């Protein structure tokens, strides 16, 4: 348990629990962005986006996640640069799907030497849905009549 918690923290996520049907987490678009690193890949996301990361081994469907490695925060007014990360910034996500991709064909052949091989490969991926970006001063809910 604590092993999975610490290794998922080294990768860059934290499991916060399943999603209840009463919760309404999918608010509309707000103009802030955050840059999160999950493993080796870095994504520049806003709320409402989706990403396809590598297979995360310690999360299930409809799990709320908190992405603990935020490298940059930005809005229309100011930018917060993490050197290397921001300990105060927080990005909320929801796990959506673990799925295999389309099969690619690995074909090797050496001409006039009587040698060829074929083999397929399917790589698994995890889809995340970004819900919230915290740490930078958001604009107010602006009903500008």
């Amino acid at each position: 348990p604590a092993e999975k918690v610490e290794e998922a923290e080294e990768i860059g996520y934290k499991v916060m629990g399943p999603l209840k049907p009463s919760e309404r987490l999918f608010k509309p678009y707000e103009p802030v962005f955050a840059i999160v690193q999950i493993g080796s890949h870095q994504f520049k996301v806003s709320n409402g986006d989706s990403i396809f990361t590598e297979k995360l081994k310690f999360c299930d469907i409809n799990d709320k996640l908190e992405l603990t490695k935020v490298l940059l925060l930005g809005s229309a007014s100011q930018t917060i640069i993490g050197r290397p990360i921001l300990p105060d910034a927080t990005v909320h996500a929801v796990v959506e799907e673990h799925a295999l991709d389309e099969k690619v064909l690995i074909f090797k052949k050496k001409r006039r030497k009587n040698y060829r091989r074929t083999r397929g490969h399917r790589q698994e991926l995890t889809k995340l849905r970004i819900t919230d970006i915290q740490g930078i001063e958001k604009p107010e809910p602006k009903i500008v009549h």
Binding site: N114, R116, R117
Partner: protein
Amino acid sequence: AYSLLSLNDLRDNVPRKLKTRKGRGIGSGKGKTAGRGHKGQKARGTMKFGFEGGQTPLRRRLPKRGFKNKFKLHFQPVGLGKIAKLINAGQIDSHELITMKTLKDVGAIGKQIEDGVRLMGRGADEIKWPLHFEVSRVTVRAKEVVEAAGGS
């Protein structure tokens, strides 16, 4: 499967090893020249085993020797140790004459006697009784050991 012997689940101790069918595709590992290499006489399959290349062979450079005796006699060897073991086993009567028929019936002599029985001196330290033998040949040690115990 409670002691079930059906014709639907019979199998052997190990899986059956199948034939190596040469001359099929690339992936079998034994296609396009099978296992024969490129050209020559051993790929056309016209080579006789034991040929040496035109050099005079070892089977013709070495001398012949001797002759064959068509009247050679073959005697089956029995040691004293086996006879003593069968005495202690209670299968050979120690007080009667030990002929060749006794040895053939007990099994100290193999399936085919040819010309008789030769008595050997192996296991001569197990003889403790005066035994009487009737064999075809006997060695010096065996006769000395028997007559030292008092037999003939």
